[PDB]
Specification:
This is part of a larger assembly, with one copy of chain A (95 residues), two copies of chain B, two copies of chain C (48 residues), one copy of chain D (81 residues) and two copies of chain E.
Chain A: H1 8-18, E1 23-24, H2 26-53, E2 58-59, H3 61-71, H4 74-94
Chain D: H1 10-19, E1 24-25, H2 29-54, E2 59-60, H3 62-72, E3 76-77
Chain E: H1 4-8, H2 14-23, E1 29-30, H3 33-59, E2 64-65, H4 67-76, H5 78-83, E3 88-89
The chains are: A mainly alpha (95), B mainly alpha (96), C alpha+beta (48), D mainly alpha (81), E mainly alpha (104).
Chain H binds a DNA duplex (40 and 40 nucleotides) through helix 2.
DNA sequence: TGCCTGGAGACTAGGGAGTAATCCCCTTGGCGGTTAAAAC
DNA sequence: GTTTTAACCGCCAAGGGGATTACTCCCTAGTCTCCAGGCA
């Protein structure tokens, strides 16, 4: 009986956004959670290294954008950068 | 009735590529894992999940290695896989 | 339970089972119906 | 526990080859595959036992195997982390 | 009280991502837009892989995504296959691929 | 042969187990009176 | 005879086998697509040449192994394809 | 009194400690961690330098050049495994 | 050679042992069948 | 196609692990000041 943070509810929300009818099993949800954690670790580590190389003490949107460009392949990287910049613009507009 | 050689092999190829079940018996693998581990440290207990993870990783590794071995066998104009094929695949992969 | 050892008339338990039902089945192997002699059961137990 | 490598059975190696797409298998493939699996298991299990020993534990958890595989370069999904 | 994910329009938690970035020892400081960008990228990748997985599931006349569907989705898409090249999916199986020379 | 190799005496099998001594006495009495015996044990090595 | 002598000569040496100016032109041409008016440090181009030559030598060794496995002395493009396919760079 | 001299090492235990602190490896760095890391780095350097010097002696030279380091790394199996995915500038490859 | 920077010297708050308790759960020899993967 | 056998379940026993969560508490790092010497 202890809290175990997971991306289960968020992955389910995204799945419902994409496929309103399909569902997901426990093993598949565990795989998705592991995938999200792995991609998060990849991007965070690449951003930390980018900040360290340029002698910067902070991780900003630029560092993560460069990390996404470095990690993901072509079309994936382009669409991911588009989504991230849309998100940051909307977040700044909402204040 | 008797199927000509190669037909049953292709049939079981299709069968085992349709499925996702583990292909090695769990108890022999558990004994092998415990036998390998007792050399490194005595009195080590394995969780069932750890043994299942090891089995999944090993089966995936062997399947990929057999794919490379089959590619080696098709190279040099053959169908049978021979130990030289496995050795070449491992050497190109960067092992050994 | 299909063994019909009515030929004997003595049973010696070298060691005793935790379950008396198993010992009872072993006895019934010789005490069953159709057996024409008195049956004696010997149980050997080590002291202390 | 001794001579457990024979637990990797000839039908098992044949099934793994069939999943890999192999049509015909030589008789000497089984010993080579047993050796290769022995080596791979030795490496992964050594790393996992190191991780378990660092935590001052005596039970090898699935997380330790996942960390060992990730260190080897063979990250595995579905078993946590 | 409005969550940062709501402001950014995303489904993934911006606050949780910010906490993980701060506690993960990646830098002395973490920017305000970094969790938003990272959450957006994670949500996009999850959406892509789940769309392909659901498309695979429909082809099998099944409603729920099983790990085999995720493996088929990842391996059939070249970019996701490159992204998850060194990744093994438990109970994922392999793609059906028999070489031409082996066929009768 | 006797100067070349020495085997444990078969007598020492009974000497090392009180159950065996008591069973020897009991079995001799039962054979004298003319009965047949079933010996039940939980272990096959004990059967040997 | 001459092939073995050439192998030994290049095997003992350490100098870069690719000419520097053509490789610099190739590097700049490749980099032109990604960004316009890019300047390169000389050390950067030297590093690129070192990495490229090491990569090519290692690949050729793997392709030679693939050719020997086919009972051939000549290396053929199928050997390069198999070397890259097994290595995983495909 | 220098901390490196206190630990009996030649590598800068102080510099290693500063690098571990400034680097984002952890929010706390123990006292013995820089000493241990400096000792490991010094031992590895001494091993590779001894092998490189032996290679230089075998070539009738007095300076270690990158070729000597390449030969030393590739000849020693353990160091070859440690630096397997590493390319040494102006080092060439092993004779074959 | 002229610095920055690593090294004493004092506080200080908290991370990380100890120490319960506490809950979960089989654990292992020798036995006896009995099928279905192996073996031949 | 025919024969072996070994996974695997059942048993019968008495309590032991062995990882988790809460309390306490005390070394041990971090932070700040000053200084001189290691090094580029």
């Amino acid at each position: 009986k202890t809290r175990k943070e997971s991306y289960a509810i968020y992955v389910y929300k995204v799945l419902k956004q994409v496929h309103p009818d399909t569902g997901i099993s426990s093993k598949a949800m565990s795989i998705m959670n592991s995938f999200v954690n792995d991609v998060f670790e990849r991007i965070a580590g690449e951003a930390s290294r980018l900040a360290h190389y340029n002698k910067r003490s902070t991780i900003t949107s630029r560092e993560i954008q460069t990390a996404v460009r470095l990690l993901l392949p072509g079309e994936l990287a382009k669409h991911a950068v588009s989504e991230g910049t849309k998100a940051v613009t909307k977040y700044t507009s909402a204040k | 009735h008797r199927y000509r050689p190669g037909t049953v092999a292709l049939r079981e190829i299709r069968r085992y590529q349709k499925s996702t079940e583990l292909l090695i018996r769990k108890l022999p693998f558990q004994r092998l894992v415990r036998e390998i581990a007792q050399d490194f440290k005595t009195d080590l207990r394995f969780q069932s999940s750890a043994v299942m993870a090891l089995q999944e990783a090993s089966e995936a590794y062997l399947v990929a290695l057999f794919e490379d071995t089959n590619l080696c066998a098709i190279h040099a104009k053959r169908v049978t896989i021979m130990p030289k094929d496995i050795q070449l695949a491992r050497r190109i992969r960067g092992e050994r | 339970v299909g063994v019909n050892l009515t030929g004997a008339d003595t049973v010696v338990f070298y060691d005793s089972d935790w379950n008396p039902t198993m010992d009872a089945q072993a006895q019934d192997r010789c005490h069953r119906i159709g057996q024409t002699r008195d049956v004696h059961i010997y149980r050997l137990i080590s002291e202390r | 526990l001794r001579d457990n490598i024979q637990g990797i059975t000839k039908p098992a190696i044949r099934r793994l080859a069939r999943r890999g797409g192999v049509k015909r298998i030589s008789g000497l493939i089984y010993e080579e595959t047993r050796g290769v699996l022995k080596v791979f298991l030795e490496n992964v299990i050594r790393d996992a036992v190191t991780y378990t020993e660092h935590a001052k534990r005596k039970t090898v958890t699935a997380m330790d195997v996942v960390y060992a595989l990730k260190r080897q370069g063979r990250t595995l999904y579905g078993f946590g982390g | 009280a409005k969550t940062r994910s709501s402001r950014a329009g995303l489904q993934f938690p911006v606050g949780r991502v910010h906490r993980l970035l701060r506690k993960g020892n990646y830098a002395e400081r973490v920017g305000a837009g970094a969790p938003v960008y990272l959450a957006a990228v994670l949500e996009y990748l999850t959406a892509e892989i789940l769309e392909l997985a659901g498309n695979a599931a429909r082809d099998n006349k099944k409603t729920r995504i099983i790990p085999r569907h995720l493996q088929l989705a990842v391996r059939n898409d070249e970019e996701l296959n490159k992204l998850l090249g060194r990744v093994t999916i438990a109970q994922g199986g392999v793609l059906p691929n028999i070489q031409s020379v082996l066929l009768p | 042969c006797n100067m070349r190799t020495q085997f444990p005496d078969l007598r020492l099998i009974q000497y090392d187990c009180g159950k065996l001594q008591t069973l020897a006495v009991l079995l001799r009495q039962l054979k004298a009176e003319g009965h047949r015996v079933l010996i039940f044990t939980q272990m096959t090595r004990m059967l040997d």
